[PDB]
Ligand binder design. Structure first.
Ligand code: XOZ
Length: 273
């Protein structure tokens, strides 16, 4: 009920909808505030907030609430100071090591296990939608295209996501379920190792045509990568969604199961900031 500027001291812009770092003045907690015009298209803003409000997981970006200020909507969220994994790759101009990827994807998979239990499908898993806080904890972000299964709707059939990362069953007319995110996770693993997903240099509308017919992608330089990492990607990129591994099962994959603690990401985060 209080004016947003009395609750929050807005600091630096982080992004440009438009995102600001801010201090919650009563607790000293740092938050991220997304500001959008109330007259803008709010379709995915409304979707993403509805999904985040239903989530309570250390592996999913928290939503704290919304204010009107003048003719803007302020969306208050958990602050992830290291930014996205794709930001960290770009800023350091370096791909991630196997150990760094195992640690990030362990936390990503715990977030997917939580969403999938709640019958949610992220549908836009990619390095750009995995954020790190300054302590190195990975959180799922951008729920703007997330789907919800129900008692009466056991499958979604909307062709939606970001083409290079989309599962074959999502692209094809057939309905699909939570394990579409596991395919996207496999593409994300390659993206973190190589800096870009398979087919990154071809037209996205051409790539979407080939993903359903092509064999599962593999590493560009297979000799660089352990048997465990190679097998982890192969298991994620099983074309049959019925056969594809779940988040729970991949948390036991040898690539993920022995991931190092978030300390392995300290150098990484320091360099990026
Ligand atoms: C030059 O290339 C583009 C530059 N990259 C970039 O601007 N990255 C970026 C990443 C983010 F994660 C950003 O957003 C955040 C930031 C921190 N902590 C958050 N907590 C929550 C967010 C979210 C906001 N939008 C949806 S979640 C958030 C952002 F604004 C910008």
């Amino acid at each position: 009920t209080k004016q947003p500027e009395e609750v929050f001291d807005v600091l630096e812009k982080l992004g440009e909808g438009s995102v600001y770092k801010a201090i919650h003045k009563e607790t000293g907690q740092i938050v991220a505030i997304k500001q959008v015009p109330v007259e803008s298209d709010l379709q995915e803003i409304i979707k993403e907030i509805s999904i985040m409000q239903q989530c309570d997981s250390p592996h999913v970006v928290k939503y704290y609430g919304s204010y009107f200020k003048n003719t803007d909507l302020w969306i208050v969220m958990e602050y992830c100071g290291a930014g996205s994994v794709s930001d960290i790759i770009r800023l350091r101009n370096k791909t991630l090591t196997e150990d760094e990827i195992a640690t990030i994807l362990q936390s990503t998979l715990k977030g997917l296990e939580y969403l999938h239990f709640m019958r949610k499908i992220h549908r836009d898993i990619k390095a750009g939608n995995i954020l790190l806080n300054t302590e190195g904890h990975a959180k799922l972000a951008d729920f703007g295209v997330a789907g919800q299964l129900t008692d009466t709707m056991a499958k979604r059939n909307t062709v939606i996501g970001t083409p290079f990362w989309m599962a074959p069953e999502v692209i094809q007319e057939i309905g699909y379920n939570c394990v579409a995110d596991i395919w996207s996770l496999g593409i994300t693993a390659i993206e973190m190792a190589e800096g870009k997903p398979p087919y990154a240099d071809i037209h996205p509308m051409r790539a979407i045509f080939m993903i359903p017919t092509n064999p599962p992608p593999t590493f560009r330089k297979p000799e660089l990568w352990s048997d465990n990492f190679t097998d982890f990607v192969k298991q994620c990129l099983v074309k049959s969604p019925e056969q594809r591994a779940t988040a729970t099962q991949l948390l036991q994959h040898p690539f993920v199961r022995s991931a190092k603690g978030v300390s392995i990401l300290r150098d990484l985060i320091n360099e990026a900031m």
